[PDB]
Scaffold this active site. Structure first.
Site, PDB file in Angstrom:
ATOM      1  N   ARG A  89     -16.506  62.260  -1.498  1.00  0.00           N
ATOM      2  CA  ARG A  89     -15.266  62.700  -2.148  1.00  0.00           C
ATOM      3  C   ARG A  89     -15.448  64.062  -2.848  1.00  0.00           C
ATOM      4  NH1 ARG A  89     -15.325  57.011  -5.202  1.00  0.00           N
ATOM      5  NH2 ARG A  89     -17.552  57.517  -4.946  1.00  0.00           N
TER       6      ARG A  89
ATOM      7  N   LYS B 244     -26.253  44.646 -12.649  1.00  0.00           N
ATOM      8  CA  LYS B 244     -25.130  45.466 -13.269  1.00  0.00           C
ATOM      9  C   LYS B 244     -23.747  45.258 -12.588  1.00  0.00           C
ATOM     10  CE  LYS B 244     -26.700  48.943 -15.308  1.00  0.00           C
ATOM     11  NZ  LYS B 244     -26.903  47.786 -16.231  1.00  0.00           N
TER      12      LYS B 244
ATOM     13  N   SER C 158     -13.580  52.467  -6.928  1.00  0.00           N
ATOM     14  CA  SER C 158     -13.426  51.083  -7.344  1.00  0.00           C
ATOM     15  C   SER C 158     -13.262  51.043  -8.827  1.00  0.00           C
ATOM     16  CB  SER C 158     -14.640  50.296  -6.949  1.00  0.00           C
ATOM     17  OG  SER C 158     -14.671  50.204  -5.550  1.00  0.00           O
TER      18      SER C 158
ATOM     19  N   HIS D 292     -12.600  53.438   1.059  1.00  0.00           N
ATOM     20  CA  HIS D 292     -13.612  52.849   1.887  1.00  0.00           C
ATOM     21  C   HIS D 292     -13.089  52.497   3.239  1.00  0.00           C
ATOM     22  CE1 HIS D 292     -16.134  51.945  -1.625  1.00  0.00           C
ATOM     23  NE2 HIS D 292     -15.123  51.303  -2.175  1.00  0.00           N
TER      24      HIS D 292
HETATM   25  N1  AGS Z   1     -11.984  57.289  -1.753  1.00  0.00           N
HETATM   26  C1  AGS Z   1     -13.124  57.367  -0.971  1.00  0.00           C
HETATM   27  N2  AGS Z   1     -13.123  58.053   0.166  1.00  0.00           N
HETATM   28  C2  AGS Z   1     -14.206  58.132   0.918  1.00  0.00           C
HETATM   29  N3  AGS Z   1     -15.337  57.545   0.592  1.00  0.00           N
HETATM   30  C3  AGS Z   1     -15.433  56.836  -0.529  1.00  0.00           C
HETATM   31  C4  AGS Z   1     -14.308  56.721  -1.363  1.00  0.00           C
HETATM   32  N4  AGS Z   1     -14.673  55.957  -2.421  1.00  0.00           N
HETATM   33  C5  AGS Z   1     -15.918  55.605  -2.292  1.00  0.00           C
HETATM   34  N5  AGS Z   1     -16.432  56.121  -1.141  1.00  0.00           N
HETATM   35  C6  AGS Z   1     -17.801  55.946  -0.648  1.00  0.00           C
HETATM   36  O1  AGS Z   1     -18.154  54.547  -0.633  1.00  0.00           O
HETATM   37  C7  AGS Z   1     -19.599  54.519  -0.629  1.00  0.00           C
HETATM   38  C8  AGS Z   1     -20.107  53.162  -1.115  1.00  0.00           C
HETATM   39  O2  AGS Z   1     -19.075  52.495  -1.844  1.00  0.00           O
HETATM   40  P1  AGS Z   1     -19.556  52.429  -3.378  1.00  0.00           P
HETATM   41  O3  AGS Z   1     -21.154  52.238  -3.432  1.00  0.00           O
HETATM   42  O4  AGS Z   1     -18.899  51.286  -4.051  1.00  0.00           O
HETATM   43  O5  AGS Z   1     -19.154  53.794  -4.127  1.00  0.00           O
HETATM   44  P2  AGS Z   1     -19.648  53.652  -5.652  1.00  0.00           P
HETATM   45  O6  AGS Z   1     -19.608  55.095  -6.365  1.00  0.00           O
HETATM   46  O7  AGS Z   1     -21.033  53.130  -5.676  1.00  0.00           O
HETATM   47  O8  AGS Z   1     -18.679  52.637  -6.441  1.00  0.00           O
HETATM   48  P3  AGS Z   1     -17.394  53.488  -6.909  1.00  0.00           P
HETATM   49  O9  AGS Z   1     -17.861  54.963  -7.353  1.00  0.00           O
HETATM   50  O10 AGS Z   1     -16.688  52.753  -8.154  1.00  0.00           O
HETATM   51  S1  AGS Z   1     -16.187  53.618  -5.498  1.00  0.00           S
HETATM   52  C9  AGS Z   1     -20.018  55.638  -1.608  1.00  0.00           C
HETATM   53  O11 AGS Z   1     -21.189  56.305  -1.135  1.00  0.00           O
HETATM   54  C10 AGS Z   1     -18.809  56.601  -1.617  1.00  0.00           C
HETATM   55  O12 AGS Z   1     -19.197  57.895  -1.149  1.00  0.00           O
END
Ligand code: AGS
Ligand code: 2VJ
Ligand code: 2VJ
Ligand code: 2VJ
Ligand code: 2VJ
Ligand code: 2VJ
Ligand code: 2VJ
Ligand code: AGS
Ligand code: AGS
Ligand code: AGS
Ligand code: AGS
Ligand code: AGS
Lengths: 160, 160, 160, 159, 159, 160
Positions: free
Chosen positions: E91, E42, E129, E18
Site C-alpha cells: 500500500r 499478540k 484490518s 486482501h
Molecule cells: N488494502 C490492501 N491492499 C493491498 N494489500 C494489502 C492491503 N492491506 C493489507 N495488505 C497486505 O496484506 C498482507 C498480509 O495481511 P496482514 O499481515 O494482515 O497485513 P498486516 O499489516 O500485518 O495487518 P494490517 O496492517 O492491520 S492489514 C500485508 O503484507 C499487506 O501488504
C-alpha cells in the site's frame, strides 16, 4: 588529535554481525571504542542486561580497544563524563534515518559538544536486526550467518 | 593514534552555512580536513571552479586545519593519493539518505579502505541548499541568514 | 472572518482535475482564491504562460470567486501585495511532502506572516500529474478522466 | 508459450541489476519479452539498435528470453503479444513511488495487465546504468556491474 | 498444480484490500494458498479458527484458492508444497521497507522462493484490518471495506 | 464568510510547544478552534484525561478563541454536532505524512463534508514529540525550551 573515544550505544538483544561490522569499522578509527548498553531500560528483551553484556564481551574479544559498559542516565552525560566527543550509529534503511534524526536533534539540544556520526550498514548485513534473528531462532533454523558463535549457542539454548 | 585526513566533497555552488556547519563540526574530530571540489565536471553551473574555491577559502579561513582542493578523476583516488581514509557528507532529508546510500555502496566497491560517515544537518540549516539560495538571490531577497558574508556579496553581484 | 484571500500557485502545464480538486475544495473557505503562475520562468514546459492561463481560466469558469494571475517575483511578495495570508498546496506522495517541506521552511524565513496549508489528494487523483497526462496524450489515449474538456482539446491539438 | 511476461526498460546499457530481475523471471513464465521504447527521445548514451544488441547478447544464455521494440503504449504491446503481466524491479523508496504512479495509470489504460514487482538482490541494489557510466567515464573497472560484452561497449565509448 | 503461489498474513480479519490481491493472482498461477500462522502471539481480535472461517467464505467463489494453517517458516511451507512464488501487497512506503527486510531474510532462508509484490488498487490503498476494526468499534458502516460475511462478524464482536 | 469551526484533535500527553505552535498558527484563520481529546482511549498514557485537559486550558488561555473539549465517538461525528468543517493536524516528518494519509482517506469515507488541512512543523519544533519530552524529563534534564511553564512544572512533579 588528543586522546579519542567513541561510544556505540544500543540494546544488543542479542548482538549480531550487523552490530559487529559497525564496531569493527570503528576500531582503527579511534583510540577507545566503548560499546554501551542501557540499565533499567524498563522494556524487557529476550535476554537480561548481564547476558547481553557477556554476549558482547565474548563477541568482541578479538578487538583489543573495545570496552563494554552500561549506564544509568543520558548517553550524552556518559560521553561528557568519559571523554568522548563522538557517538557512532548505523543505518540500515529510511526507517533508521528518521528515528535517528529526531534523536540526534534532541541530543544536540542536550549537549552541543557531542556529535553523532552515521555509517551505512554494509550490503550483506542491512536486513539484519536482532528481532528478526530471534524470530528465525524460534523456528530453530540455521542462524550461523547472522550472529557470532557464542550468541548462536545462547539462542539455541534459549529456543529449546 | 595515527594521522587522519577527512575529505568533504561537493560542488559548493556556492558554499552555504549548511555546508559550513558540516565542515566546522568535523574539524575537532580529524587532524586535517580536505574540502574537495570536482575540477571539470561536464555539469556546469553558476560559479566557476575558481570562483567556488575562493568562496570556500574565504569562508573557511577561521579554521587552521581546513584546506581547499580541486580534482578530476574519481574521488576515492583523490583520497588515496592524499592518504585520507574517510569521506564526510551531510544528510538533510530522506532523499539525501537514499542518494547517499547508493553512492557509498559504489565507492566501497571502488576502494574498500575508504569509509563514508554522515552527519545530520542542524535543524536550522536542514532546508538550505545552493539551489534554493540562488533562486532566493535572483529575486534579491535577503540571504545573510543562509550563506557567509563573502558568498553573500558574490551572490548580490552575480544577480545584480 | 476578514476579507480573506488564498493563493494557489503552480506551473499548471496543463491544469488537471488533480489541481481542480484542490481549487474546488478551497473555494468555499475563503472570500477569494488566486491561482497564481510565475512569469519569466526560464524553465519552459509544453504550453506558454499565455496558453496555460487561458486553460486555467476556462477550467475554473464555473466558480465565481477564483482568479488567475501572474507574477513577477517571490510568491510571498505577491501574497504581501494582494493581502493574502495563506498559500494552498496539494500533497500526493512522500516525494511531494519532502519537497514542499523544504520550500515552506524557506518561505517561512522570507515572510513569517504567510502560512502554507496542505491538502491531501483525493484517492482517484493521487496518481495524476501534468507530466503523466502529457505522456498519455502523446499516444493519443483517452484523457477525459484526467483533464477537463477544454484542456483536453488543447492537448489533442498539441500532440498531432 | 501459454504465459508471457514483459520486462520493459531503457537499458542504457543493461547491467547485472537488470539481468538478475530477468533471470529470476525466466522459470516462472513460458516466455519473457524484454521491451525497449522505439522513438523515445533524449538519447544518448547508446542508440536503440545498440541497446537491443547489448541486451540480446547478455540474455543469449536464457532460452526463453526474446528482445523486442515497440513505439506505442506498453499495455498495448502486451495485449498484442498475449502478455498478462509486466515485471519491474525495485531498489528503493524512490523507485517504489515512481512505480506506484506508473501502474495506477497503466491500470486505467488496461485493467487486465498486472505489474509484479521484485526486490533487487542485496548485491545489485546500488546499481543503475547512470552510475555504471560515471564510473566508466573515469576509466575505472566495471566487470563486477555489467556483463563482458557490455563492459566492452562501454570502454569503446569512454575510450 | 504445476504452479503454486502462497499468500501469507494475519487476516485479522480479511478485508477487500486482501481480497483484491488474492483475486488479481488467481488467473496467473494454477493454485493459490492463503496461509496463516499457527501458534501466533499478540491477538486478538479474532481467533485462528474464526479467521480461517472468514477467509474460506470470502474466497469460495475462487475455485483455485485454498486456505491453510501452518506452524513453521513460511519458506518451509512453500518448498514442501511445491510453491516457488510468494505474493504480497504494497500500500505504502512503510509497507515497502518492512517487506524489503522480510524478503531479504527469506531469500537467505531459501533461495529458490521469489517474493512478488503487487500494488494495492487506488480504491483500497488506505484499508487495513486495524483501521476497519477501529471504525466497527464505533458502529459506523464498514460494508465498503470488508465482504458481507466479515461485516456480520465485525458487527457481532463490537455490538 | 459564514462562521467557521476547526478541530485540532490529539492525545496531548502532554501538550508541547510543537502542538501549541500549530494551535497558534490556526487562531487567526478560523472563528472557533476546538482542541479535542478522546474520552476513554483504552491505551492510557502518562497523564489522565483530566490532567491533560487542565494542562491545555492553561496553555491556551491567552487565545480567547481556543476551547478545550473531550469526546467519546468518532472524530467526524464530533465535527458534525458542533458544525466544524475542518480538522487540523501538524506534520513533522515522513512517518507523520503516511500515517495521516491513511487516516484522512478513511475520515473522507466516513463523512466527505469535513476537510483535513495540514501544517508543517516549524523547524525548531520539528523533533519534538510528547514521547521524547517525557524521556528527557525522566532523566531530570531541562525541558523548558520544549513546553510551556505550566507543563514544565507538572512533569518535574511527575518524574521527581
Ligand atoms: N488494502 C490492501 N491492499 C493491498 N494489500 C494489502 C492491503 N492491506 C493489507 N495488505 C497486505 O496484506 C498482507 C498480509 O495481511 P496482514 O499481515 O494482515 O497485513 P498486516 O499489516 O500485518 O495487518 P494490517 O496492517 O492491520 S492489514 C500485508 O503484507 C499487506 O501488504
Ligand atoms: C543517538 C543515541 C541515543 C539513543 C537513544 S535510544 C532511545 N530512543 C528512545 C528511547 C526511549 O524512549 O527510552 N531510547 N536515546 C538517546 C537519547 C534520545 C533523547 C533522550 C535521551 C536518550 C538517552 O540518552 N537515553 C539514555 C541512554 C543511555 C545509554 C544508552 Cl546506550 C542509550 Cl541508547 C540511551 N540517544
Ligand atoms: C559521496 C561522494 C561522492 C560524490 C559524487 S557526486 C556525483 N555522483 C554522480 C554524479 C554524476 O553523474 O554527475 N556526480 N560522486 C561520488 C562517486 C560515486 C560513485 C561513482 C564515482 C563518483 C565520483 O567519484 N565522481 C567524481 C568526483 C570527483 C571529485 C569529487 Cl569532489 C566528486 Cl563530488 C566527484 N562520490
Ligand atoms: C510552495 C509555494 C512555492 C512554490 C514554488 S515552485 C518553485 N519554482 C522554483 C522552485 C525552486 O527552485 O525550488 N520552486 N516556489 C516557492 C518559493 C520557494 C522558496 C524560494 C522562492 C520560491 C518562490 O517564491 N518562487 C517564485 C514563485 C514560484 C511559484 C509562483 Cl506561482 C510564483 Cl508567483 C513565484 N514557493
Ligand atoms: C510500468 C512500465 C512503464 C514504464 C514507462 S517509462 C520508464 N520508467 C523508468 C524509465 C527509465 O528509468 O528510463 N522509463 N512508462 C510506462 C507507462 C506509464 C503510464 C503512461 C504510459 C507509459 C507507457 O506505456 N509508455 C510507453 C513505453 C514505455 C516503456 C517501454 Cl519499453 C515501452 Cl515498449 C513503451 N510504463
Ligand atoms: C513475506 C512473508 C513473511 C511474513 C512474515 S509475517 C511476520 N511474523 C512475524 C514477523 C516479524 O517479527 O517480523 N513477521 N514473516 C516472514 C518471515 C520473514 C523471515 C523470518 C521468518 C518469517 C516467517 O517465515 N514467519 C513464519 C510465517 C509463516 C506463515 C505465515 Cl502465513 C506467516 Cl504471516 C509467517 N515472512
Ligand atoms: C486525523 C484525526 C484522527 C485521529 C485519529 S487517532 C487514531 N487513529 C487510529 C487509532 C487507533 O487505532 O487507536 N487512533 N483517528 C481518527 C479517525 C481515523 C478513522 C477511524 C476513526 C478515528 C477516530 O475518529 N477516532 C476517534 C477519535 C475521537 C476524538 C479524537 Cl480527538 C480522536 Cl484523535 C480520535 N482521526
Ligand atoms: N544489521 C545492522 N547493520 C548496521 N547497523 C545496525 C544493524 N543492526 C542494528 N544496527 C544499528 O545498531 C544500533 C543499535 O542497534 P539496536 O538498538 O541493538 O537495534 P534495535 O532497534 O534496538 O533493535 P534492532 O537491532 O533494530 S531489532 C542502531 O543504530 C541500529 O540501527
Ligand atoms: N544544509 C545542509 N546541511 C547539511 N548538509 C548539507 C547541506 N547542504 C548540503 N549538504 C551536503 O553537503 C554535501 C555536498 O553538498 P553539494 O553537493 O555541494 O550540494 P548539491 O547537492 O550539489 O546541490 P544542493 O543544491 O546543495 S542540494 C552533500 O552530502 C549535501 O547533501
Ligand atoms: N493530482 C493532484 N492532486 C493533488 N495535488 C496536486 C495534484 N497534482 C499536482 N498537485 C499539486 O498542485 C501544486 C502544483 O503542482 P504543479 O507545479 O502544477 O505541477 P508540478 O508538480 O510542478 O508538475 P506535476 O507534473 O503536476 S508533478 C503542487 O502542490 C502539486 O503537488
Ligand atoms: N539494480 C537493479 N536491481 C533491480 N532492478 C533494477 C535495477 N536497476 C534497474 N532496475 C529496474 O529495471 C527497470 C527498468 O530499468 P531502467 O528503466 O533502465 O531504470 P534506469 O533508467 O536504468 O535507472 P537509470 O540509471 O536512472 S537510467 C525499472 O523498474 C528499474 O527500477
Ligand atoms: N512538534 C510538532 N510540531 C507540529 N505538529 C506536531 C508536533 N508534534 C505533534 N504534532 C501533531 O499534532 C498531532 C499530535 O498530537 P499527539 O500525537 O497526540 O502528541 P505527539 O507530540 O505526536 O507526541 P507523540 O503523539 O507521543 S509521537 C498530530 O497531528 C501530530 O503530528
Amino acid at each position: 588529535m588528543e586522546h579519542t573515544i567513541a561510544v556505540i550505544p544500543g540494546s544488543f538483544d542479542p548482538i549480531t554481525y550487523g552490530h559487529l561490522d559497525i564496531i569493527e569499522r570503528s576500531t582503527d578509527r579511534f583510540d577507545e571504542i566503548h560499546v554501551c548498553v542501557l540499565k533499567n531500560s524498563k522494556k524487557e528483551g529476550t535476554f537480561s542486561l548481564e547476558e547481553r553484556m557477556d554476549l558482547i564481551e565474548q563477541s568482541v574479544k578479538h578487538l583489543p580497544n573495545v570496552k563494554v559498559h552500561q549506564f544509568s542516565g543520558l548517553l550524552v552525560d556518559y560521553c561528557e563524563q568519559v571523554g568522548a566527543k563522538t557517538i557512532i550509529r548505523g543505518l540500515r534503511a529510511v526507517s533508521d534515518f528518521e528515528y535517528e534524526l529526531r534523536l540526534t536533534s534532541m541530543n544536540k539540544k542536550l549537549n552541543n559538544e557531542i556529535e553523532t556520526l552515521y555509517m551505512m550498514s554494509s550490503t550483506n548485513y542491512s536486513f539484519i536486526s536482532s528481532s528478526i534473528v530471534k524470530e528465525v531462532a524460534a523456528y530453530r533454523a540455521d542462524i550461523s550467518e547472522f550472529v557470532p558463535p557464542y550468541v548462536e549457542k545462547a539462542l539455541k539454548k534459549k529456543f529449546k
